[PDB]
């Protein structure tokens, strides 16, 4: 009834089967994932139905079953780690020196240059202490067409 | 087939031996109100 803390995969069921559409993180009784992964669709856990409790389209984040409980924030110089729950692949941790997105008429936010499939969207990015700094899956394509994601946090 | 189902695949942690990859660079981008990022 309380979702065990950890990384969960989002699975959608079609007439062609089950596919991992994305991932989220459970912490403190609430499920956190990227808004574009679910767009507010409800989840099910062992017959327990979860509905979105908060969402922000511009941050591309949505939470289920309570308020946003991920408190980690990037310091600006720590090496970061991406736990990548790619569809059909074993969970792997990848560490990187972060990139940066300078938004016009705004502020700085960190970014990670690691290219992972759709369905890895919502994977956690964490600092050396193991607290969650942001989620993965919202970013840009650069000149070589690789994907670069932002460390999406509230 | 009306909603999405959750499956646990692992737990959030920092692995000390984790493989390092990626490249560090600075990009200035625009952000729309719909959460879209563009260069």
CATH number of the domain that residue A108 is part of: 2.40.10.10
Domain boundary among A70, A96, A113: A70
Experimental method: X-ray
User: B20 is written with which tokens?
Assistant: 């390092």
Q: In Å, how far is B39's CA from the nearest CA of chain A?
A: 7
Q: In Å, how far is B36's CA from the nearest CA of chain A?
A: 8
Quick one: A76 and A63 in the same domain? no
Of B18, B28, B34, the CB nearest to A58: B34
Q: Which domain holds residue A88?
A: 71-154
Nearest to A3 by CA among A49, A39, A35: A49
Q: Which residues contact A52 (CB under 8 A, 6 or more apart)?
A: A38, A40, A42, A62, A63, A64
- Set of chain B residues whose Cβ sits within 8 Å of the Cβ of A130: 12-14
How many domains, in total, are found in chain A? 2
Helices (H) and strands (E) in chain A, counts: 1, 14
Direct distance between the N- and C-terminal alpha carbons of chain A, in angstroms, rounded to an integer: 26
Domain boundary among A20, A39, A70: A70
Of B6, B18, B37, the CB nearest to A150: B37
Full strand arrangement of the beta sheet holding B37-38: B19-20, A92-96, A80-84, A123-126, A132-141, A147-152, A108-112, A99-103, B26-31, B37-38
Quick one: A13 and A50 in the same domain? yes
Is the Cβ of B16 closer than 8 Å to some Cβ of chain A?
no
Cβ-contact A25, B30 below 8 angstroms: no
């Amino acid at each position: 009834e309380y979702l065990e803390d950890g990384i969960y995969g989002i699975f959608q069921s079609t007439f062609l089967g089950a596919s991992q559409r994305g991932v989220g993180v459970a912490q403190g009784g609430v499920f956190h994932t990227m808004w574009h992964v679910t767009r507010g669709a409800f989840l099910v856990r062992n017959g327990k139905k979860l509905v979105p409790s908060w969402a922000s389209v511009k941050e591309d984040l949505v939470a289920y079953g309570g308020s946003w409980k991920l408190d980690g924030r990037w310091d600006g110089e720590e090496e970061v780690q991406l736990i990548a729950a790619a569809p059909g692949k074993n969970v792997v941790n990848v560490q990187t020196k972060p990139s940066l997105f300078k938004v016009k008429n705004g502020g700085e936010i960190g970014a990670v240059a690691l290219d992972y499939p759709s369905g890895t969207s919502g994977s956690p990015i964490v600092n050396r202490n193991g607290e969650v700094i942001g989620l993965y899956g919202n970013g840009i394509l650069v000149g070589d067409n690789s994907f670069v994601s932002a460390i999406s946090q509230t | 087939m009306d909603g999405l189902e959750l499956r646990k695949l692992g737990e959030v942690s920092w692995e000390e031996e984790a493989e390092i990859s990626g490249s560090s660079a600075r990009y200035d981008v625009t952000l729309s109100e719909q959460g879209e990022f563009k260069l």
